[PDB]
Structures are given as C-alpha cells and as structure tokens.
Amino acid sequence: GSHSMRYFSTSVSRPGRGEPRFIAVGYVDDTQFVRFDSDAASQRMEPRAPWIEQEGPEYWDEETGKVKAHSQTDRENLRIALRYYNQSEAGSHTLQMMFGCDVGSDGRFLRGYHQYAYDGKDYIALKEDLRSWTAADMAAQITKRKWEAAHVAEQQRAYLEGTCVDGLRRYLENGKETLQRTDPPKTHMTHHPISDHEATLRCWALGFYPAEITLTWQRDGEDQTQDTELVETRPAGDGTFQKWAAVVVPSGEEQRYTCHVQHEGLPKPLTLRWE
C-alpha cells in the first residue's frame, strides 16, 4: 500500500515565438491535483482536484511563487545548455525535470527523486542515497561539480525527506475519498468472427483505479503469450482507466480460452470465459 507524489515539468524553447513554454503538473499516485501553464491567463498554480480547491490563499501564493520561479530558472537552464552543447538559438530544445517522494502504508519515507533530462535524454539525477549525483555526459559532469560545491544534494534531501513526505501524507488524508479509493475493474468479453474458422475474443477491463492492472489469456490453463494483442492502459477521462486483451482463436474452441484479471480491487484474481 505505498503511495507517491510526483511533479513533472517541461520547458520547451520556441525560437522567434517568444519565451519558452513551461508546463508543470503535480500527481499523487495516478491522480493529478495541480497544474501550472505559462501560456494560461493566471500565471498561477491552479487546482486540478476537488479536494485541493479548499487550500487557502497562502498555499496558492507560495506554490505559485515556487513554480513560477522554477519556470524562470529552467528558462535560464535552457540558455546554459545551449552554451554547454554549442547549440544555436534557432532550434527548439526541451528541458524536463521530475521530483517527488514515495511513502509506505505506514506513511514512512521510502524514496526520493530529483532528475533532469535534456532533449529527451538523461542529463543529471540525484542518486537513491540523496547525497550524490549521476551525470549522463561530460557537460552534466560540469553541473555535478557545481552542485557538489554548492551542497545542492543536502538542500534537496531536506525537502525530499521532510516537506515532500509531510505534503504527501497530508494530501493522502485530505484527498482520502479520491486517493485512497479502489475502483475494481468492470469486465466483459466480446466475440467477432474474422474468417471461416477463426474468431477474435476480446477481454475488457473498464472503470478501474488505480491504473496498475494485468490481463492475461490462457488456453487450457497455459499462458498464451502469442496470437494476443494487448493495448496500453488508457485514461477514460472520469478518473478511471481502461484496458483490453484480445486473442485469435479457432471457431468452436472459444471455451478453451480464459482471460485472467489482476487488480488491487480484486482480492482474488478473476477468470473470464466466453458465454
């Protein structure tokens, strides 16, 4: 029963079209709760969950100050990256940052994260011990030496083990009805003939939360990893997720195939069989 809090930020340079676009989103597990978009009208951190709306003006002002100041810092970081890589001011580049923490079911700290990617590749990351860095190339080694000199890891560790954990614990309690819920999957099976002797069986899992699920097909109790198509778990738009797994079977042999469903909302795994 572990939980996570993550913020994902993206700065994208737009040469000849103004300042870089900056977007930051905050999640608790699979639920988004805040956003910041430099293109939006407010220039403020905005609520994206019913349970966070109640936070007072000191919260919204402090969070706005932090995310806006980060957008201005990462705007300057795009310029520094152009200098490290000798890249022209005419091309579009991306700087992504992720940070956050994980807590166990008892609310105790489990893990902390702080990492950057430049143009879709790892640039520099704080290691699991929260005291040292992994640099992906020789330009990131220059950054690593600057951050060691300025004791940056000790400043990040303080947030990651303190404020981050306190914040996630508070959100899990405040947003309990949304965040601590489990929506088990609602399942159904469809059947469509594809040829004179073959049909497609499709096993559906709808309306579930959290997103983590496993759908597997078996033929006479044997794991069928071939003649199977699996789609990536996708958001429904209402706070739940969907997924399906399909198998091409010989006509008249539908009853030999079973679809197995595993999810946090199913204390025992479920087995589905056509008709």
């Binding site: 905050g26 810092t73 970081n77 702080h114 640039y123 990131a140 950054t143 940056v152």
Partner: peptide, 9 residues
C-alpha cells in the same frame, strides 16, 4: 508542495 530549491545547471 512544490520543491523550494532551484538550481542552475
């Protein structure tokens, strides 16, 4: 709670 520590690369 957003990270309060900002760093230049």
């Amino acid at each position: 709670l957003y990270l309060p520590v900002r760093v230049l690369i």
